[PDB]
Amino acid sequence: GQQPLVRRVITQLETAATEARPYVNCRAVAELLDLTYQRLIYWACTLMPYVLFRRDTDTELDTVLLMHFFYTHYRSVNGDLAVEFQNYVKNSVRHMSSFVSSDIDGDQKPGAEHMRDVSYKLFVGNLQARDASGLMFPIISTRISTVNLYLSPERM
Amino acid sequence: DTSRTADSALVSTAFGGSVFQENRLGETPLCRDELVAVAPGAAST
Amino acid sequence: TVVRVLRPPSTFEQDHSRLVLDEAFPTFPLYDA
Amino acid sequence: DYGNVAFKYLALRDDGRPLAWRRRCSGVVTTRYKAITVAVAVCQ
């Protein structure tokens, strides 16, 4: 597992910093530690695993949304996420039509403006796709009655 | 001949009815142009 | 000289058109492995 | 100032061909208008 390796190596780095901690006054060591911490935190925030996301109460929309956020915030090395997305969309074909509008009225609904991209590259079957063509797809129903029956409140 | 009336003239019920028409979700996704369009029967060259 | 320019629409419905040759001028009868 | 967001957007969009999404979408009169044109011309 990559997570225990990350934990042990960052613990080693923390021990190293503790060895270098006492002389915090110096500006040279100040900027050295500053840059070190910047790099390590920027790397750690991105290298997050995906194990903690899956829950038994998670629905199809919740799972696709979790892996969508994973794609839009973490794509450096985790390249199999798109393959899993393509595999999963074929599973939830019947469930994907439950939480959508008609064509003509969905676009005018509030909040579809910001979620048009996530919806488009949900429907297309490839998270790498770009909505440059300005196409209109089945807009997601954002109503609370639909959301509660098709989502989970914790992963909003 | 019925062909002359059918070609040089159209049924008044098409004129009376609504002109614009909507479209469905099922093709490879539509754009704005396809979203609301004139009905093919009402449209004339 | 160019007269018109057209684009193929993305919409399609199968025409299933039955063409009939209106026999306004019947031809002469056919006479003789 | 332009006085409008759409004015600025359509003024700075002038790059090469005018409309791009119209090309991207890749996409004829109402018969009533033709009939009224014919009738008005005949009456006049």
Which chain B residue is nearest to residue C11, measuring alpha carbons? B27
Q: Quote the tokens at residue B17.
A: 């009815």
* D40: enclosing H helix or E strand: helix D31-43
* B21: enclosing H helix or E strand: strand B20-22
Identify residues of B whose CB sits under 8 angstroms from chain C CBs.
23, 27-28, 30, 34
Q: Beta B20-22 vs B36-38: how paired, if at all? A: antiparallel
* B35: enclosing H helix or E strand: helix B32-35
Note whether A133 and D22 are within 8 A (CB): no
Contacts 24+ apart (CB under 8 A), A48-53: A48/A74, A49/A2, A49/A3, A50/A78, A50/A81, A51/A3
Note whether A141 and A99 are within 8 A (CB): yes
Q: Which of D23, D24, D25, D26 to substitute to test the interface with C, most C CBs within 10 Å?
A: D26
Structure method: cryo-EM
Q: How far is B22 from chain A (nearest CA, A)?
A: 7
Q: How far is C20 from chain D (nearest CA, A)?
A: 27
Q: How far is C9 from chain D (nearest CA, A)?
A: 6
- Report resolution (Å) to 1 decimal: 3.5
CA distance A126 to A79: 12
